[PDB]
């Protein structure tokens, strides 16, 4: 390759530095986020080069990696993996990142033993299948007996949150996550639970709004508070309707006709509002802006009107008020209205918001998030998003596994017991798969500062002789029973960590040659 080069401005690496630099660049990703694994990890601050640097403090590996700007063509492979984990389940993004890195570290050591890269891949495929069975046979189901099901949701919410900023506020934010999802009783849209961020007060001062909050305060000449209001939402035009004729002009002999037409213009706007008001409404929300003329007509009628609460605000209101978009009003008897108790405005963080309280069929909620600083608000918001994403799926697939390293040791056990039944050419590779699986409880203990030399030996010794629920007790620094402590993880989150790390890791092992095209726009 370096001798007799026939390339224009490109280069290539073969069999010498191609794999060396690929393993170094990719494995480094794991060490970056390694410190974020477990309940005692430290958080990162990510900084930009300038031009409104927009400082970000975060813990989650996905938010860290997606803002680094990795240039190495091989390291990018694991970055995309962590993106997929975030999009699918929204948790475990650190665990899958560091697991893939540890698998790749072992592969480099296996190449040093002169093991063919296809033998290493073949061994990992067999080890992966062994690990998949360990998860299938150890899953815990939850069906009926709702007093036990709700407890499972509290355990899943607590586990996810324990790894984020919301550490010693678990007694407030655990309920905000579990109950907000249970109140939806429907599709996991993950937009029906809105978060409003305000400065002032502590994290413990956050609360759940039983109703629905709107922006865009109640008009100019309109009632501020109506009891037992009927709610109508709309997606129609208030003014400049320009009814559907393109290229039409008013061409008259004198300005007298223009004035007469101007009156007709307003008469039709008056009729339009009357057609809406015949519905018998107290509150009107329209996506499109409200102009001076209909504002007076709605005020004179004693009916409030909200303009452009949001683009999707009307759709969200439809779900929490029990109505319909109603972009056209020509059959009032076919239009369903909503109902609430109060439409009064409330003061939250020195900002007046419109509070729809006591709303019937209210399949939505809002969480009011309070904090001292903007960095606290942004990380606390993300913590709520992560927990709600997992819970919205747990209520659909109730299978869970035991956490605290329990599942990882069970997977490593199955791989080890079967690897010892295979010939050495491949067993050396299957054993390396199990060794990577055991690195996860090692990293967790190491981040906390526990003597991992004893926790790993004790946990493996426990699982060697039954004790299929044994795991790490991160409070005392010992080995405990995960079922009694209540440390569980979603089955789907754990399945994807196993499968994604194995599938992504193969991508690096298969490559012996990197060909780099000539760069553009670099002078």
């Amino acid at each position: 390759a370096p001798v007799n080069i026939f390339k224009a401005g490109a280069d290539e690496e073969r069999a010498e530095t191609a794999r060396l630099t690929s393993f170094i660049g990719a494995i480094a990703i794991g060490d970056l986020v390694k410190s974020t694994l477990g309940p005692k990890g430290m958080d990162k601050i990510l900084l930009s080069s300038g031009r409104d640097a927009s400082l970000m403090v975060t813990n989650d590996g996905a938010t860290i990696l997606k803002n680094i700007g990795v240039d190495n063509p091989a390291a990018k492979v694991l970055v995309d993996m962590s993106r997929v984990q975030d999009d699918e389940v929204g948790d475990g993004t650190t665990s899958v990142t560091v697991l893939a890195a540890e698998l790749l570290r072992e592969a480099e050591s296996l190449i040093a033993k002169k093991i063919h890269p296809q033998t290493i891949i073949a061994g990992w495929r067999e080890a992966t299948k062994a690990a998949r069975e360990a998860l299938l046979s150890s899953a815990v189901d939850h069906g009926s007996d709702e007093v036990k099901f709700r407890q499972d949701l509290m355990n899943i919410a607590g586990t996810t949150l324990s790894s984020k900023l919301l550490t010693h506020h678990k007694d407030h934010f655990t309920k905000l996550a579990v109950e907000a999802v249970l109140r939806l009783k429907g599709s996991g849209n993950l937009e029906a639970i809105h978060i409003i961020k305000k400065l002032g007060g502590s994290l413990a001062d956050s609360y759940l709004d039983e109703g629905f909050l709107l922006d865009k305060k109640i008009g100019v000449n309109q009632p501020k508070r109506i009891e037992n209001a009927k709610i109508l939402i709309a997606n129609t035009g208030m003014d400049t309707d320009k009814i559907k004729i393109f290229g039409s002009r008013v061409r008259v002999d004198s300005t007298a006709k223009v004035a007469e037409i101007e009156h007709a213009e307003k008469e039709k706007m008056k009729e339009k509002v009357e057609r809406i008001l015949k519905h018998g409404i107290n509150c009107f929300i329209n996506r499109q802006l409200i102009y001076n003329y209909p504002e007076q007509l709605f005020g004179a009628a004693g009916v409030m009107a909200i303009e452009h609460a949001d683009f999707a605000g009307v759709e969200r209101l439809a779900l929490v008020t029990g109505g319909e978009i109603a972009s056209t009003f020509d059959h009032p008897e076919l239009v369903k209205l909503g109902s609430c108790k109060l439409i009064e405005e409330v003061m939250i963080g020195e900002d007046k918001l419109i509070h729809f309280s006591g709303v019937a069929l209210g399949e939505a909620c809002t969480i009011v998030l309070r904090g001292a600083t903007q960095q606290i608000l942004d990380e606390a918001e993300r913590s709520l998003h992560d927990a709600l994403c997992v819970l919205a799926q747990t209520v659909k697939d109730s299978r869970t596994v035991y956490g605290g390293g329990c599942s990882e040791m069970l997977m490593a056990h199955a791989v080890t017991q079967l690897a010892n039944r295979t010939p050495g050419k491949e067993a050396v590779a299957m054993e390396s798969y199990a060794k990577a699986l055991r690195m996860l409880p090692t990293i967790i203990a190491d981040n906390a500062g526990y003597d991992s030399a004893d926790l790993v030996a004790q946990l493996r010794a426990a699982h060697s002789e039954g004790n299929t629920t044994a795991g790490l007790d991160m409070r005392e620094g010992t080995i405990g029973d995960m079922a009694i402590l209540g440390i569980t993880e979603s089955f789907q989150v754990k399945r994807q960590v196993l499968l994604s790390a194995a599938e992504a890791a193969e991508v690096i092992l298969r490559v012996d040659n990197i060909i780099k095209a000539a760069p553009r726009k670099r002078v």
């Binding site: 026939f6 390339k7 224009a8 401005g9 490109a10 191609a18 690929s22 063509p73 091989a74 990018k76 492979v77 995309d80 993996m81 997929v84 999009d87 929204g90 063919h116 890269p117 296809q118 495929r125 993950l190 997606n235 009814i243 559907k244 004729i245 393109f246 290229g247 039409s248 002009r249 008013v250 061409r251 008259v252 006709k257 037409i261 007709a264 039709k268 439809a318 319909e324 978009i325 109603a326 972009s327 056209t328 059959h331 076919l334 994403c389 994807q496 499968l499 599938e503 992504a504 991508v507 298969r510 490559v511 012996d512 040659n513 990197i514 060909i515 780099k516 095209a517 000539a518 553009r520």
Partner: protein, 535 residues
């Protein structure tokens, strides 16, 4: 000399002659051979199921790990006039057959490498090229002696699935060795025109979405399109679809020419506003009169239409793309109606279950028509744990579709694993000495070049080439030449019939023919006229 004549004056023949580069001699031939060795060695490590893949980094930073030769070479910044032709060779093989994207490069390389010592012996460059053609016919005529299949393209698809396994066995999706082989068989056999033996790949759509794993790859007897329901409260399920397909926008008719409507009186102002409000009723009721319960629209909707769709319980999608609305019409058997007033029940499409598929936490909620009647179009949905495996899987499945089409056009097959190449090499050697008139050296060189494939396969499999070929070739002359090949794990015996290593006859026939012509047109050159500086 240049820039100096016998009388001291400058000597100028061609523009910028002092900044040109010219080489003829015998070194132009050596330079062509040197460049060919670089190309052949580049892909040598990606031949066979035990080969390794390459990582290609594009000029914009995108990274793809590739198995197919067409992509590997197309992404290289090659600055040599003959090396580019070797890239074009791989492209032609990809366009004609779709299999030997590496084989034609390795084979062509060996023929050019053998030319090196043939030239050193003093053999005229043309004689070398002519000898290759004379021996190439012998390999081709022998190749066609051994072939048989019983594929009927009805139900006995076992040897067809086996062919797809051979094609996919070298790809990055071996975790679906069986699953994807069967998808490819069903995808082609359900759209091919068996009466004319015409396969139209436009009827097989390749789609995918990041997420899931390779085991989730499915064949959909229908279409997958981007969802965009006109009204947010439309039902998520249609039990029995009667589909009206229009390309007319849901707005009052506008003329295509300059219009400029004159409004004078208040009676004209109010009347025109009234008339327009009545037109939205017609474009909707004219759909209901046909019994339709799902509208497909290439254009968008006006706001007034969106509410009327709710009132009449008429779900609809908006802004359906060009190939999407054409594909729905084909899959559902309907027709596109230019206007609303031309709507009739006879032009409606017929389909069953229509529903959305949700993916993780995303907001895509793609719309799929799953049930159909006698559709001639299918969709293949590729999933995977990352972008890298998915994009390569799309190309891997393309190869599986091509080899099935190749058997449909010509159902003659050969044995792979190097068996066909070794057998041809032996045949040429047997005739090379019957009779060594002038070209004995070239006929033997061709036969040796044919073996570059099982030898490179042996190297990539970890075996000693010359030791492996000695044992394999000896067994094929001691007995009536059986189809013996090589492998890494040996799989017991090396009988390609028992390992089910099946390749297409017309594939290898074209690999020999295209390589033979490409070698000739790059040996029969004695002048390289590459320019110098760009300015």
């Amino acid at each position: 000399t240049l820039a100096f004549d016998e009388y001291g004056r400058p000597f100028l023949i061609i523009k910028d002659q002092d900044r040109k580069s010219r080489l003829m001699g015998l070194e132009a031939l050596k330079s062509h051979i040197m460049a060919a060795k670089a190309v052949a060695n580049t892909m040598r490590t990606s031949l066979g199921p035990n080969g390794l893949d390459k990582m290609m980094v594009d000029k914009d930073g995108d990274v793809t790990v590739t198995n197919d030769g067409a992509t590997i070479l197309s992404m290289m910044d090659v600055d040599h006039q003959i090396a580019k032709l070797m890239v074009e060779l791989s492209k032609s093989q990809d366009d004609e057959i779709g299999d030997g994207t590496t084989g034609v490069v390795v084979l062509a390389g060996a023929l050019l490498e053998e030319a090196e010592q043939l030239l050193d012996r003093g053999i005229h460059p043309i004689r070398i090229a002519d000898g290759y053609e004379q021996a190439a016919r012998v390999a081709i005529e022998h190749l066609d002696k051994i072939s048989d299949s019983v594929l009927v393209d009805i139900k006995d698809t076992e040897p067809l699935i086996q062919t797809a396994k051979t094609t996919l066995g070298s790809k990055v999706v071996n975790s679906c060795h069986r699953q994807m082989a069967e998808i490819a068989v069903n995808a082609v056999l359900t759209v091919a025109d068996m009466e004319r033996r015409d396969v139209d790949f436009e009827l097989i759509k390749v789609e995918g979405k990041v997420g899931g794993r390779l085991e989730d790859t499915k064949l959909i007897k229908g279409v997958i399109v981007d969802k965009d329901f006109s009204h947010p409260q439309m039902p998520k399920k249609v039990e029995d679809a009667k589909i009206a397909i229009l390309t007319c926008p849901f707005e009052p008719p506008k003329p295509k020419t300059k219009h400029k409507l004159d409004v004078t009186s208040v009676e004209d102002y109010k009347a025109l506003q009234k008339y327009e409000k009545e037109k939205f009723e017609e474009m909707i009721q004219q759909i209901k009169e046909t019994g339709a319960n799902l509208a497909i629209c290439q254009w968008g909707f006006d706001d007034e239409a969106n509410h009327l769709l709710l009132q009449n319980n008429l779900p609809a999608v908006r802004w359906v793309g060009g190939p999407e609305i054409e594909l729905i019409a084909i899959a559902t058997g309907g027709r596109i109606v230019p206007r609303f007033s031309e709507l009739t029940a006879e032009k409606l499409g017929f389909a069953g279950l229509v529903q959305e598929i949700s993916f993780g936490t995303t907001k895509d909620k793609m719309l799929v028509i799953e049930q159909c009647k006698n559709s001639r179009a299918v969709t293949i949905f590729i999933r995977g744990g990352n972008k890298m495996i998915i994009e390569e899987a799309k190309r891997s499945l393309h190869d599986a579709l091509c080899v099935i089409r190749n058997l449909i056009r010509d159902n003659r097959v050969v044995y792979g694993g190097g068996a066909a190449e070794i057998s041809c090499a032996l045949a040429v050697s047997q005739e090379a000495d019957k009779c060594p008139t002038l070209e004995q050296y070239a006929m033997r060189a061709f036969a040796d070049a044919l073996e570059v494939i099982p030898m490179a396969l042996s190297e990539n499999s970890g075996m000693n080439p010359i030791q492996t070929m000695t044992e394999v070739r000896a067994r094929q002359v001691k007995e009536m030449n059986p189809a013996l090949g090589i492998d890494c794990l040996h799989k017991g015996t090396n009988d390609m019939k028992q390992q089910h290593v099946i390749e297409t006859l017309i594939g290898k026939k074209q690999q020999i023919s295209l390589a033979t012509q490409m070698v000739r047109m790059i040996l029969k050159i004695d002048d390289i006229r590459k320019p110098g500086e760009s300015e």
